[PDB]
């Protein structure tokens with residue numbers, strides 16, 4: 001078994017791409033790229049696509065559990081929210097790509113213990129004004145789940161205690177509820 005089988009991930013994941021085109025509605029700009037459910041298929045996908053730092057501004061990547069679309073409207077996102085990492089323009093060079101890949105591995109490696117079931121997915125927004133990365137969770141009222149994912153996330157990105165990150169509900173997005 002060991003010699004020849006791919007290594008299965010706990011979940012099947014879908015990678016999505018967004019390109020800003022003012023000709024189209026936001027949802028029409030959102031497109032699914034492919035899915036994978038093994039370590040080896042993840043790295044084949046990742047190794048084939050552009051680093052976030054190399055995308056034109058206005059683009060997003062999103063990685064979500066199969067069955068969950070990367071949009072507020074989805075039943076598993078409507079009552080939820082996101083842990084938000086805001087980066088300055090200098091961090092495009094220094095942090096964007098490494099932070100995004102760490103976010104990817106927190107999801108597929110199920111890095112948040114009993115609360116990895118609350119995880120829906122993650123998004124990186126590439127923007128001239130300042131890039132963003134976020135982990136989306138499914139229920140903004142689940143205080144223990146949300147806070148625990150926030151603490152683990154902050155430390156896995158190696159952020160200092162001088163930084164604070166915020167959790168915002170999509171309901172208000174469409175203010176911070178929690179900070180760690």
Ligand SMILES: C[n+]1cn([C@@H]2O[C@H](COP(=O)(O)O[P@](=O)(S)OP(=O)(O)OC[C@H]3O[C@@H](n4cnc5c(=O)nc(N)[nH]c54)[C@H](O)[C@@H]3O)[C@H]3OC(C)(C)O[C@H]32)c2nc(N)[nH]c(=O)c21
Pocket residue numbers: 020021022023024025026027029058070071072073125127
């Ligand atoms: C995650 N998400 C994002 N959006 C859309 O993206 C925007 C929200 O994201 P955020 O607050 O980060 O803004 P951002 O992504 S930094 O966009 P931006 O301000 O850089 O965009 C530049 C300009 O272009 C406009 N824009 C942005 N995306 C699109 C677009 O896809 N199509 C058109 N026609 N115009 C667009 C936007 O209104 C702005 O004036 C909202 O704009 C509109 C089109 C009104 O819908 C929102 C969403 N819409 C829905 N229904 N559901 C979502 O989950 C969702």
